[PDB]
Design a protein around this ligand. Structure first.
Ligand SMILES: CCCCCCCC/C=C\CCCCCCCC(=O)O[C@H](COC(=O)CCCCCCCCCCCCCCC)COP(=O)(O)OCCN
Ligand SMILES: CCCCCCCC/C=C\CCCCCCCC(=O)O[C@H](COC(=O)CCCCCCCCCCCCCCC)COP(=O)(O)OCCN
Ligand SMILES: CCCCCCCC/C=C\CCCCCCCC(=O)O[C@H](COC(=O)CCCCCCCCCCCCCCC)COP(=O)(O)OCCN
Ligand SMILES: CCCCCCCCCCCCO[C@@H]1O[C@H](CO)[C@@H](O[C@H]2O[C@H](CO)[C@@H](O)[C@H](O)[C@H]2O)[C@H](O)[C@H]1O
Ligand SMILES: *C(=S)NCCCCCCCCCCCCC
Ligand SMILES: [Cl-]
Ligand SMILES: [Cl-]
Length: 509
């Protein structure tokens, strides 16, 4: 009829795809409508049916663009307040970045139509997840890639959460793409066949959330303090800011010495080269050890290399009891994955001059090793990720050890203001504690500071944009989750036989 004829128009499909792409942003924090992920995915899968391959790529691009345009546009805040560029280019960069991520969604759309053009059950439950896995993997890897807004993260409190400990968050990406597809097939074909699968598949891993892969150790229960310094970003790296920042963090810590055994300061909390603060660090360490407490804090460290040059690192150092401070101490962590433009400039010979966005304070850094040992503090192992690194689930898992007591992440999210970015970031961190079944301590400058439980639950948190310290009791856990023993080669073999089956079929006809 006419309604169908309207739906059939391409321009109508492009507009619908925008709304369905943007709808997905609603799935992540702070909104947390986990069904919005299924709605948004259904739109992407259904809206591409019955189209030429290049036609479908354009729909997918718009769906990605709707999702990335609505979901990661908060980047604009950090570009506007500190980027020092005119209005139009600022939004041009934000749209450019969204367009770049949209190519990966669009590419998914386009190859799916070419090889599986018939709207079949094979196309949407067997080719799409595997191809999504590949394209989404590619988005996260290319050019030191950005894997933001994966729908599996929206399932942290939803029914599929019992699945991450076994196979990781990308398995939830895989199933969500698959179950959302059978629903799309049911509608368009008005067939109850995909519907009866989609709900069993969806509900089958609901009992998984009840498996407790870990055993808690209340003997080792400790009082932990995390201090939210709330240093404004505009002043953080100002040289006149240092004394005040040191006073803020020191004054907050000294009364907790002897009460909290672990005290944590956030990323690059000490805004000075480690070698320039030896008297402070040494006296602080002595004071801590006398009271029985240990301190873990971020700091910048320029260190001489084999070729007589200096690599500056974004680093965590430990001090105090059972973690004595020394510049020669090995009890430290150097950030490995660096945020583009924020910590390094891609073409400095040409890009550093252009604008104060391409020259930001402390934006030349070197990378630490991909694998580093735990921070040891008074007998507690700490597996550490700095700021952004916590969203890289495979990397955290590879640094994870069986004797790890807590996951640790310290971050400065003051760039993004009061946007939804810090919440998306905070939500993804929660997935790591669920995947590995250990509590997570998150210390931030003004961003979401919290303790996350072994099942991904929130144990305690403090409000944003305030200068206070979170002190609570936290208890470590032991045992290894399936995902902790494997990484995600198994989802990849599933991706592999699924992908193989599909290519053979699209090769039969
Ligand atoms: C049926 C028809 C439906 C049509 C399709 C719907 C498409 C959906 C459209 C949009 C999706 C949402 C996009 C939000 C837009 C970005 C947010 C925004 O409006 O701006 C910002 C406002 O955004 C907000 O909503 C404020 C956020 C308040 C934070 C407090 C919320 C608490 C969240 C709790 C999270 C739950 C805990 C779990 C987390 C692990 C303004 O902030 P700014 O820093 O002053 O400057 C912003 C400049 N960019
Ligand atoms: C073609 C594909 C890409 C083209 C488009 C590129 C556009 C760039 C978009 C977004 C990049 C802007 C990111 C700026 C946010 C700041 C990142 C950052 O530094 O996070 C840091 C935290 O990690 C900030 O913490 P800090 O240690 O206090 O500051 C040290 C200064 N480096
Ligand atoms: C032509 C489209 C075919 C659609 C279906 C084909 C899907 C099958 C393709 C590749 C199967 C991958 C083979 C399994 C390898 C398992 C080994 C393994 O676990 O290594 C993993 C990492 O290494 C990899 O898996 C690499 C993934 C290979 C991607 C395939 C490259 C495709 C190149 C362009 C594809 C464009 C689509 C087709 C073009 C016509 C484990 O680490 P991680 O979890 O990825 O960490 C994340 C790092 N950012
Ligand atoms: C229609 C779809 C179009 C797709 C979009 C087009 C973008 C084209 C650019 C492709 C260039 C690829 O260049 C890309 O560079 C970076 C390094 O700089 C590589 O990645 C490098 O950093 C990553 C970060 O994890 C390391 O883990 C990796 O081992 C390393 O080699 C990418 O793996 C490489 O492939
Ligand atoms: C701690 S700093 N949190 C990090 C978030 C800022 C990310 C914005 C990075 C822009 C990605 C550019 C890379 C585009 C893919 C190559
Ligand atoms: Cl069919
Ligand atoms: Cl000691």
């Amino acid at each position: 009829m006419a309604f169908a004829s309207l739906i059939e128009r391409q321009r109508i499909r492009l507009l619908l795809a925008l709304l369905f792409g943007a709808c997905g942003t609603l799935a992540f924090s702070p909104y947390d409508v986990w069904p919005a992920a299924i709605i948004s995915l259904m739109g992407l899968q259904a809206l591409t049916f019955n189209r030429r391959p290049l036609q479908s790529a354009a729909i997918g691009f718009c769906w990605g663009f709707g999702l990335f345009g609505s979901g990661i546009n908060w980047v604009y805040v950090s570009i506007a307040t500190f980027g020092g560029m005119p209005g139009p280019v600022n939004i041009f960069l934000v749209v450019l970045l969204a367009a770049y991520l949209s190519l990966y969604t669009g590419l998914f759309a386009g190859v799916l139509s070419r090889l599986w053009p018939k709207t079949t059950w094979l196309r949407v439950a067997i080719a799409a997840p595997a191809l999504w896995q590949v394209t989404e993997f590619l988005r996260g890897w290319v050019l030191t890639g950005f894997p933001w807004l994966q729908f599996g993260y929206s399932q942290i409190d939803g029914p599929l959460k019992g699945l991450a400990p076994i196979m990781g968050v990308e398995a939830i990406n895989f199933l969500l793409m698959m179950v959302s597809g059978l629903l799309a097939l049911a509608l368009v074909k008005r067939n109850w066949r995909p519907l009866v699968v989609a709900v069993v598949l969806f509900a089958l891993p609901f009992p998984l959330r009840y498996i407790q892969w870990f055993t808690p150790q209340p003997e080792k229960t400790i009082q932990v303090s995390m201090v939210q310094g709330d240093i404004p970003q505009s002043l953080k790296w100002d040289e006149g800011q240092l004394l005040n920042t040191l006073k803020i963090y020191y004054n907050a810590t000294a009364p907790l010495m002897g009460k909290s055994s672990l005290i944590i300061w956030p990323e690059s909390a000490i805004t000075d080269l480690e070698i320039n603060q030896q008297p402070f660090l040494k006296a602080l360490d002595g004071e801590l050890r006398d009271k029985g407490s240990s301190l873990v804090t971020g700091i910048v460290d320029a260190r001489l290399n084999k070729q007589n040059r200096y690599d500056t690192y974004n680093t965590i150092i430990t001090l105090g009891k059972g973690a004595p401070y020394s510049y020669e101490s090995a009890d430290r962590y150097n950030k490995n994955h660096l945020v583009p433009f924020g910590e390094f400039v891609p073409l400095e010979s040409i890009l550093r001059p252009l604008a104060p966005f391409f020259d930001l304070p402390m934006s030349s850094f070197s990378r630490g090793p991909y694998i580093q040992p735990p921070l040891s503090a008074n007998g507690i192992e700490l597996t550490a990720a700095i700021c952004y690194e916590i969203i890289l689930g495979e990397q955290v898992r590879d640094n994870f050890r069986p004797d790890t007591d807590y996951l640790l992440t310290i971050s400065n999210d003051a760039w993004f203001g009061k946007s939804i970015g810090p919440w998306q970031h905070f939500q993804m961190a929660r997935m790591r504690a669920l995947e590995l079944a250990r509590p997570l301590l998150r210390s931030t400058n003004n961003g979401i500071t919290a303790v996350i439980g072994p099942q991904g639950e929130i144990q305690a948190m403090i409000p944003q944009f305030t200068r206070e310290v979170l002190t609570t009791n936290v208890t470590p856990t032991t045992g290894l989750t399936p995902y902790a023993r494997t990484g995600n080669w198994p989802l990849w073999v599933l991706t592999a036989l699924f992908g193989f089956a599909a290519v053979l079929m699209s090769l039969r006809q």
